[PDB]
Every structure is written in structure tokens, then in C-alpha cells.
Design a protein around this ligand. Structure first.
Ligand SMILES: NC(=O)c1ccc[n+]([C@@H]2O[C@H](COP(=O)([O-])OP(=O)(O)OC[C@H]3O[C@@H](n4cnc5c(N)ncnc54)[C@H](O)[C@@H]3O)[C@@H](O)[C@H]2O)c1
Ligand SMILES: NC(=O)c1ccc[n+]([C@@H]2O[C@H](COP(=O)([O-])OP(=O)(O)OC[C@H]3O[C@@H](n4cnc5c(N)ncnc54)[C@H](O)[C@@H]3O)[C@@H](O)[C@H]2O)c1
Ligand SMILES: NC(=O)c1ccc[n+]([C@@H]2O[C@H](COP(=O)([O-])OP(=O)(O)OC[C@H]3O[C@@H](n4cnc5c(N)ncnc54)[C@H](O)[C@@H]3O)[C@@H](O)[C@H]2O)c1
Ligand SMILES: NC(=O)c1ccc[n+]([C@@H]2O[C@H](COP(=O)([O-])OP(=O)(O)OC[C@H]3O[C@@H](n4cnc5c(N)ncnc54)[C@H](O)[C@@H]3O)[C@@H](O)[C@H]2O)c1
Ligand SMILES: [Zn+2]
Ligand SMILES: [Zn+2]
Ligand SMILES: [Zn+2]
Ligand SMILES: [Zn+2]
Ligand SMILES: [Zn+2]
Ligand SMILES: [Zn+2]
Ligand SMILES: [Zn+2]
Ligand SMILES: [Zn+2]
Ligand SMILES: [Zn+2]
Lengths: 270, 326, 302, 335
């Protein structure tokens, strides 16, 4: 029961789609396919699907578009053909990147890329990442590509092992006593419960940044005296922008990031 | 809304000519039709000097009222008052996405009234409504039109230079753009010193709020003491004053077009880490900002109105040294 | 810590001696073994190596008193120097006296000629602190800001913010603070934001109170990508809604006192008439009387 | 122990750079230290001083790329002790002005004419008196003095410029010149994640650029390279012809960094700079924090400066060689 219109629109034949739990009348957001654009172009979808006409979109921040709330690809707006209403929200897949890898890049890589870029990570950064799963594992690779030294905390042995293979410079279950408090230029929390926030706050340096990218609790608290006195910054981050997706696919193209991609959906995988 | 209208079309072979038999386009999905309320008129003269297009309605300073909208237009509705963002960016490239839709490669040759159709007509088809800015209720269409370049352009430069209330700036040339620059810079809280060779421009500069105005900087002004220098003339001599009087780590903005090339002293630029920044027109978001400043009374552009049919008479006048209502 | 035969130190090579002209007095009420952290004076003697100052220079002290040698100080962020914790002027290190030894002259700001020592002293914290926060938030003439709490700091914040060209809305529970806020140039002043103010509409929210309720207003009214600056210290911990912070990309930025360069900036604004701190003068010997008064709730010439 | 006399190379406007065997060795005062020089680099900037009248003062020991070991300290010095290995921050900032306080101690007004080996005494000698020990950076254990010396300028200068340009893993950058500075710039830029294209007029510098990790190296950019396609252009030569290539190939809103000093003046096309919003950013040397960052990159193996050593007495021979562009990479001298 398919669509087919195009006035300022295009038609995308879906080649790969990635797989929500917190969510759980629209087809359900990690999309790569084939058709500023001409038939045969390979493209990936920028989930936040910004309007393109507001101050946020114009802007460089099309991910926080107020007009598109409730109209994100597969989350307000898993199917064989997708009529793309707003072709501005597409990114060209490079020739050497497969549709499967592109699809797996549209969120699992895009999201930590956007946060790392926001934090202004550089080859002198000394960063802490908490949680090395879907997002976290890609965050390791993105961070290393920015030149950073990367320390990973994860409760799960297997995630610690994967983190070592993906290039982390140190991996631990808990930070040992020899790690000085106040020594990391940035802390990225992919878990975001209170305990994990409190470690970011203890181990972030003065003027450093805490990026609570995970969504593990509805509220978090920070110590105010400490945040003020040491000028800590907490920056929210959501998904990514169209330009960020271009950047991600370039990194993936150049071999700097290799996402791990693997419909019994009910039972990252693409 | 009518099916025909009048307007002034430019052709490389025969200049700018009245046509009273022009079509009025129906918007497609994604487009809108603007009823032109005011359209401003030196860049149109440059036309006589051989610059940008071939068979387009001129007029690049445009204010109007949305008359009809296509499908898939959700940001605007009939009756909305809007001003056009001249560079008319594509909206799909990295520059536009971006925050720098003023340097869009895909829109070169497609700017409003300078390659694509503009405001010297009654009804303008806007192919890219993203390139519109809402006119506040207390701002007239005439003043909005006069803001779309004369205020937009210096505002874009001043914002890029990151001027603040601790800035100590030098502006060279207080004419059309320079005078508006004075007002914009004061609204950012800056101290403003103005150099102009013409007595009348110096007088006007005082009236517009400059803190000091001079023909030449006196010997008591220390070299290396201004945080930013904006040069609205841009010949070598005025560049050299910017370079001598800019502070270390300060910025020179050569916003005028008085010479095709300018030289800088390299040892000085390097040692004192001087920055030279190019600036062109402005962005959509800059226009929103400008209209807010105008709305709040912080900037008051100077504008006289006339009927669009009078345009040829005023073109000759400007050529020998104003907005239009269609 | 009490009052008439204290010694006067001779500076070593890299030090200087400051003759105190004015010293300001809330935090004093709240290091071990001279207080007074809002200091203006005149250089009275310099040590052999000192090239940036000479006898007769009028200077104000930047309270955090950074070490000058660490990465934070080198840096541009001398206000968060780890080495100087416990060594701040009048809060761990020695203005409530006639002559102050400045170990570390980099932590001084030249007072402009047309600014009095009294005003300079009242600028060193009451103006410096909100200036530092406003500058960090990158306020501009297009900014639409909310300030909560219009007292000592908040009132100066109003004037600093208006100098940057911002539109300023003030919330305060106390009628008299609302009145002062109106006089100091705020564009709108309220006891509670009326229902007509749209949520998500302010580019920056500065909370000079910083209890939970006041944080929650900042979080409801800050626009996407906007900034919340919890400058007050009204609770030890505050909480934020995560989904909202992430989804709308809100930023919370800590701010502490100010830097040496910020103090140069503040004294320039004061010099140019942009900010006019409110100050009454008295003799330093009167200090104990004014301390009691503020408790049951001014600058001093030694 | 420490001798009371020593040898070194002094510059004077009247008679150029000359060996002297009767130089004093100063005893530090309270806040000072004495550095025994282990390695000192030679820079193309020494040539501008000797042969082009680039005026930095008169009558000082040259050598501005300095690594050594603390030989004695004055009474009040606690941050360093005898035996510490340190490299000098060339601009030798005052520490007390707004620029130094600041984060920009490289453009200190007070220190004009007082830079190590360029107004104040430098490293072409056995023992250097350091008046301001703030302007030192600790050499990590695994970094040799020769490499640290090369790092104080040949690496520091391009690091500072690259950082100022905000190079990232999505940057596509052009570097012109692959000698002392340019070779390091290659490695620094790769550590920031950039794609790097190099131009050099000398075959042996091109060959070295390839070995240092450049993604492309050319004499002249081929036709397949689109104008307006580089996010940043770093010119380590800075003559009009190389500036023009930066200006043709930089993207809109991109940056041109004229780090080299090959002409007294350069010109730009104004219409092009304005229309495409090109930025030209001056960059000088680097800062104390930058040097700590650089030595950490070198220590972590991300940057491996190309350096060959020689005895300080050989300096006049290597000066001639550099003047004729006769070697690649840096040469440093052991006193
Ligand atoms: N901000 C955004 O735009 C955005 C986008 C996508 C996902 N998310 C959120 O990011 C989070 C991570 O998603 P994912 O897909 O990578 O998750 P995932 O399940 O693949 O991985 C979670 C990891 O966290 C580790 N972990 C959990 N609790 C821990 C603890 N207490 N201490 C140390 N390690 C711990 C687990 O061992 C696991 O390795 C989720 O909360 C998700 O809702 C946010
Ligand atoms: N747009 C660009 O901006 C520039 C200015 O635009 P405008 O329309 O505002 O120009 P304008 O002619 O309206 O004003 C120019 C001003 O510059 C002053 N001036 C000219 N040459 C000068 C010099 N050499 N020294 C000091 N003052 C000088 C004039 O007295 C006049 O006030 C133009 O070059 C144009 O290409
Ligand atoms: N960030 C720093 O570096 C720094 C420096 C100095 C002081 N401070 C802190 O800033 C805060 C204020 O200091 P001050 O000198 O301005 O205090 P103040 O007593 O002079 O002013 C406080 C004002 O807040 C108002 N207020 C209190 N609670 C309120 C609420 N719930 N809602 C609305 N208004 C309320 C009061 O009516 C009064 O007008 C203090 O917590 C102080 O410790 C911070
Ligand atoms: N801005 C600063 O702070 C600063 C600091 C140090 C050096 N410099 C300047 O940087 C420049 C480079 O110094 P260096 O020590 O690396 O020089 P070097 O002599 O070690 O190397 C110069 C390189 O440039 C190449 N080259 C020369 N002319 C060329 C041209 N026209 N086109 C392409 N390639 C060319 C040569 O083949 C050689 O490989 C010098 O001018 C020096 O004065 C500037
Ligand atoms: Zn939008
Ligand atoms: Zn997903
Ligand atoms: Zn575009
Ligand atoms: Zn115009
Ligand atoms: Zn410090
Ligand atoms: Zn105080
Ligand atoms: Zn050198
Ligand atoms: Zn050098
Ligand atoms: Zn200095």
C-alpha cells in the first residue's frame, strides 16, 4: 500500500534500515537507499527531518527544529519505498560505503559524532566515556579519529573487551584509585543514571564538559558549588544534523570509523 | 490576484525596460507568491558597468505580503509580511545548512533581482521561501526594504567581528553602509571612531552617535589601539590605516570595494596575529536580527518613498549622485 | 579576626606593595589567620623584577589571585586555578589594612583615571561576577534574557546586560527589588512570569537565587540551544530534566567570580559610564559597625 | 662543575654572527635559573636576521629552538630543580600583561626584542641564563633533547596555526612548503584527523612529505583539483605566487594562514575575499600551553620531527647550507 508522489519531493528505494525501547500511526529511523539529486543517487536519511525554513534550521542546528517535533523519520513521520518530503534531510552515501553500514551510521555513529564535535574534542583531549554499547563503541572510534586519549568504563566484561579492540587507551569496570579526580577534559555518559553522572562530575577537570548523552533517568542532579567553582559545563546533545551525517559518512568512507552492523525484529543490526 | 502585471526587466543587450504585459505565476508546491509592497534601489547601476544576469526582474531589496502559498508551505500563510534575503541560498548544501547561506555556490547567479527575479514588479514568485524573514508589526514595508542590504550588510560584518561593549572600533567611510554601521555598532555597545574625508559625512556621523569623528586620526591616537577596523572605502591608503591602528589579535574588515587588490604587511600581520575577514551581504538569520533591531528602535534607516513607475527617473539621479511602491 | 601595629612588608623581586585606597565588604559574613576581598589602591613600592607596574599606578585586585604558572592561568582562566584555592585576596591570603603585599602582581587590574577607588573597589566582585557570566553566555543585542533575583549581583547584571544591548526580563519576589530593577533599565519586571510568556523563549537564563524552583523556571523558559547560568548558591544540588536538556540541547554553564582580564573590561565599562555601581564610603575604623548592620541586614578608606 | 666562561655565537649588526670563546656564565638571581644547553635548532628565521636585516635587536647569542637541563636555580625557584630537562618557549612572555594572562603569551608587547635567541640570549652557547622560568616546558622522559629542540619552533609554530584554524577530522587542507615547519605541519594536521595535500618546489622535500603521511604531494596542483575546495591553506613560504595559490584553492569561508615570511608584503584579491568570505589569519610562533601540548604529542608518538644533529662549532657550515635549501628537516646542534 505504497505512496508515489513527487512535487518538491523524491522517491527513495530503501536498501537498508536499522533497528525504540523507550518508545515502546506511522511506519517506524535508520535509513539508507537509492533514488540536487538524480535517479541512482545513494542517500541516507537525517532522522530529525528539520523544516529547513526556521532560525534553527538556517541555523546549522536543524536537529532542534520546533516545526519538526513529531515529524522525525520513523518517529512521528521498516517499509519498501519512502517518499521523501524534504530532500534537504538526505546525505549522499560515498561509493565505497555499503547501504548496510550507512544505515547503521545514521544514529549509532551520528549521535556520538555530534556530541564529540560539540565538546570540541582535539588531540590534546583526555576523555572518559561511560558505557561502550551501540553508541559508546562508535564514540570510541569517533573520539580516536579526533585524536583524543580515551578511557572507557563499562560494567559488562564483553563491552570492555570490544572497547579494547576498538582502540580505547584504557578500559575499566571502575576507575582505580590512581586516577586523579578532576583530570578529564570531557566526560561522555552513555548511561546517564545518577551514579554515572556523579562519576562524570568527580572526574571532569575544571572548565571541562559533561555530556549526558544516555537517557537512563528522567532527572539528574549536579552539585552546584562544585559546578560553579570549577566552571563545569553540561551540554545537552540530540541526534545530529544533516552536515554531521555528511561528516560521519566521510569518516566511515575513509576507514576512520567501522560500525559493527550485523525481519525477526521482535526477537546494532541492519 | 491578477493574472497580469507590470515590471522592469533587465537584458544584457537592451538594459532595464518597462513591460506592462508580465505574467503572474501560480506557486507550485514549496513556493509562494509575494505581493511587493516596497523595493529599494548603487549595485543596480553597476547594468551600466557590466556585472550578474540576463533577463530577470531587477530589485534586490524587497519587502512584501504573502499573496498565495503552494502545498508544503507551513511556515508562511497568506497575509504574512516578509522581507527577502537577497543571496537566496539553495537550502540543501553544506554552506546553507551551514548558517552561511550567503556564500551558497548553487545560488550564484540566482540572487533576488540579480540573476533571479526581484522586486521591481507587483508580484514575485519566491521559489525558496526559506529565504524570507518576517517583518515585525511595527516596522513598515519601506523601512524593511531599506534594511535588506543597507543595514543587513554592515550588521553581518559587525556580528562577524564579534563586537561587544568593550570594543574600540574604527570605521573608515560614513556613507550609505557606513552610517548604518555606526548605528549598528553603537547598538552592540561599542565605542565608535569614524574617519571620513567629507565634512558633511563627518557631521552626519556625529549625529548618528559616533563617539569621535575625524578627517585624519590625530597624533594622540596610539597605533595598535582598535579592536576592530571596518573599511567602507577599501583602497590601499585606508587599508594601511586599518593595519597601523588595529590592535594585536584585532580584526580588519575590508567591506568596501575601492580597489581590486589590497596589500598587507606580512611581518606585522604575523607577529601581531592580525586577522582580515571577508564579509558579503548577509544571512537569513542576520535579517531576522536586523529587523528586530529596527523594530526596537536601535537602528533607523533613512528612506524616502516613490511609485515604482518613477524608477527610471531615480536611476538617472543616483547615477549623477529610495524605495518604490508598486 | 580583629583590629593597630601590624607590620608592613617589603616586596621581594617579583612582588609589590599596594597602598589600599578603598576596600568593599556578603561572603565576608559567611583560609585561617587580613580579610577584605574587594580592593582598590595605589602601588607604593615594587620589587626588583617588576615591569608591568610602577609606584603611583592605581590598581584593583582580582580576588581569585591565580598562580600564573598553570595551564588554567596560561590559560585565560585564572579564576579556576587549582594552586590558588585557599590563597584568594582576603579569603585565605591577605584589603582591611593600610598596605597589602601582593605576591603575584599579574592579578591586578589598572583603574582608569576617571574611576574613583571607591567605585573600583565595589566593581571587583558585585560587577565582575555578573559580567563574567554574561560574557560567558555570549549575550548580544539580539538576546532575550531572563534574570532571576535582582539584589547586589542581579542589579549589576541588569546594567551589564543592557550594556550588551540585550532585552532584559527580571523576576524577583521582593517589591523593592522589582522597583530598583525598573530604575536600572530592565525591560520587564515581574513577581511571576505571566502565562502569556511563551515557554522556551529566552536565549539565556541567569539565576542569582539557584533553588530548585528557580532552576525549574530557567529550564522551562530557556529556548532550544539556550543557556542556563546558575550563578546563585541557594541549594547544594540541583536537578534538571534530562529528556528536556538532551532533546532541546540546553546548556548549563558554571561561572565563578571573574578573571584578571574581565576586571579590565569591567573597569572600562564603569569608566565609560555604562555601569554605575551603587557605593557609600566610610573610614576603615568604622568596619565593625557596618559588619553588624549588614548582619542585621559599602566601601572603606583606610 | 659549571665553568665561569664558555663559547657561543653572538650576532651584531656591524659584523654578523661570530664565534666568541670568552662569554660569561651567569649565576642566577633568586627567581632565575641556568640552563645547560643540550640541543639548539637552526631555523630559516635566523637567516632573515643575519642576511635580510630582519631586526630583533643587536648583540645577543642567537639560537631560538632550545632544549637543555637545569644546571642551577636561584633561591626562590621551586618548580624546577637541577637535572630537570626543559625546552624554552621562544617568545619569552612577561607573564603579567593582558596578553600573557591572556592565553596569548606569544604576542606579549613587553617581550618584543626579548625573545630567546632573537633579542635576548639564546641557545648557540653552552649555558643560558633564563630570567623567566615560567617560559619553560618540561621535556617528557622519552623525548630526546634533539627532538625537543626541533619541537620548540618547527613543530610549535605549525601546531599553533593548525589549532587556530580549528582543523578537525573533516578538514581538507593544503600545505605549501615541506621543510622544517611544513614537515611537522603534516604530522600535526594528520594527528588532528585532516586530509593533507602538500606542495613543495624541491624533490627531496616532496619525497619526505610522502614518508611523513601526507595524503597527496605535488609540485603543482593538477587540473583535477577543483579551485575553492580546501577548508584551510597553510603557506609556509609566503611569496605572492604561493599566496595566490592559497587564495584560488581555499573554499568559501575557508582560511588562509600565511605562516611563512618570504616577502615583506602580500596582496589579496578583494572582490574574491569579500564575496567568498575568505579569512586570513596571522599566526606567530606559539604559546607556553601550546609547547606542553606539542611535547605531549611528540611523547605519544603522533609527531616525529625530522632532525639531524651536529656539533655547535659546525653552525656556520649549516647556515650556508640552509641558505641554499640544501637539506631537508631540521638540523640541531649539541654545544
Ligand atoms: N541523545 C540522543 O540523541 C540519543 C540517541 C540514541 C540513543 N540514546 C540513548 O543512549 C543510551 C545508550 O544507547 P545504546 O544504543 O548505546 O545502548 P546499549 O544498550 O547498546 O549499551 C549500553 C551500555 O551501557 C553499559 N552500562 C549500563 N549501565 C552501566 C553502568 N551503570 N556503569 C557502566 N556501564 C554501564 C552496558 O554494559 C552497555 O554496554 C540509551 O540511554 C539511549 O536511550 C540517546
Ligand atoms: N558596497 C561597497 O561599500 C562601499 C561603500 O558603500 P556606500 O554606498 O556606503 O558608499 P558611499 O559613497 O555612500 O559613501 C562613501 C563614503 O566614503 C568616504 N570616503 C571615500 N573615500 C575616502 C577616503 N579615501 N578616506 C576617507 N573617507 C573616504 C566618503 O566621504 C563617503 O562618506 C563601496 O566601495 C561599495 O563597493
Ligand atoms: N557565582 C559567584 O561567583 C558568586 C559570587 C558572589 C555571590 N554569589 C551568590 O549569588 C547569590 C545572590 O547574591 P546577592 O549578593 O545578589 O544576594 P542579595 O540578597 O543581594 O539578592 C538576592 C535577591 O534575590 C531575591 N530572591 C531570593 N529568593 C528568590 C526566589 N525564590 N525567587 C525570586 N527572587 C528571589 C531577593 O528578593 C533579592 O532581591 C547568593 O547565593 C550568593 O552566594 C555567587
Ligand atoms: N610565523 C612564525 O611564527 C614563523 C616561525 C618560524 C618560521 N617561520 C617562517 O616559516 C618559513 C619556513 O621556515 P622553515 O624553517 O620550515 O624553512 P626550511 O628552509 O626548513 O624549508 C623551506 C621549504 O620551503 C620550500 N619552498 C621554498 N620556496 C618554495 C616555493 N616557492 N614553493 C614551494 N615550496 C617552496 C623549500 O623547498 C623547503 O622545503 C620561513 O620563511 C620562516 O621564516 C615563521
Ligand atoms: Zn526548522
Ligand atoms: Zn536508532
Ligand atoms: Zn546552498
Ligand atoms: Zn542594494
Ligand atoms: Zn594557576
Ligand atoms: Zn564580595
Ligand atoms: Zn627557528
Ligand atoms: Zn624560528
Ligand atoms: Zn606579557
Amino acid at each position: 500500500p505504497v505512496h508515489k508522489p513527487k512535487a518538491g519531493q523524491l522517491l527513495l528505494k530503501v536498501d537498508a534500515v536499522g533497528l525504540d525501547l523507550h518508545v515502546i500511526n506511522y511506519v517506524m529511523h535508520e535509513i539508507a537507499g537509492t533514488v540536487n539529486y538524480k535517479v541512482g543517487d545513494r542517500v541516507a536519511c537525517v532522522g530529525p527531518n528539520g523544516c529547513g525554513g526556521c532560525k534553527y534550521c538556517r541555523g546549522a542546528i536543524d536537529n532542534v527544529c520546533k516545526n519538526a517535533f513529531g515529524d522525525w523519520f520513523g518517529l512521528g513521520y521498516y517499509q519498501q519505498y519512502l517518499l521523501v518530503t524534504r530532500p534537504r534531510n538526505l546525505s549522499r552515501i560515498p561509493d565505497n560505503v555499503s547501504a548496510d553500514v550507512a544505515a547503521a551510521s545514521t544514529d549509532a555513529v551520528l549521535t556520538p559524532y555530534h556530541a564529540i564535535k560539540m565538546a570540541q574534542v582535539s588531540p590534546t583531549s583526555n576523555i572518559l566515556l561511560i558505557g561502550a554499547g551501540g553508541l559508546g563503541g562508535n564514540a570510541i572510534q569517533v573520539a580516536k579519529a579526533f585524536g583524543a586519549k580515551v578511557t572507557v568504563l563499562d560494567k559488562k566484561k564483553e563491552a570492555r573487551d570490544q572497547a579494547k579492540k576498538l582502540g580505547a587507551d584504557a578500559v575499566y569496570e571502575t576507575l582505580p584509585e590512581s586516577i586523579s579526580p578532576g583530570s578529564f577534559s570531557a566526560c561522555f555518559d552513555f548511561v546517564s543514571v545518577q551514579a554515572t553522572f556523579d562519576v562524570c562530575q568527580k572526574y571532569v577537570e575544571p572548565k571541562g564538559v559533561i555530556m549526558p548523552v544516555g537517557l537512563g533517568a528522567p532527572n539528574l542532579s549536579f552539585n552546584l558549588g562544585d559546578l560553579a567553582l570549577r566552571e563545569i559545563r553540561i551540554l545537552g546533545s540530540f541526534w545530529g544534523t544533516t552536515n554531521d551525517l555528511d561528516d560521519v559518512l566521510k569518516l566511515v568512507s575513509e576507514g576512520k570509523v567501522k560500525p559493527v552492523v550485523r525481519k525477526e525484529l521482535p526477537e546494532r543490526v541492519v
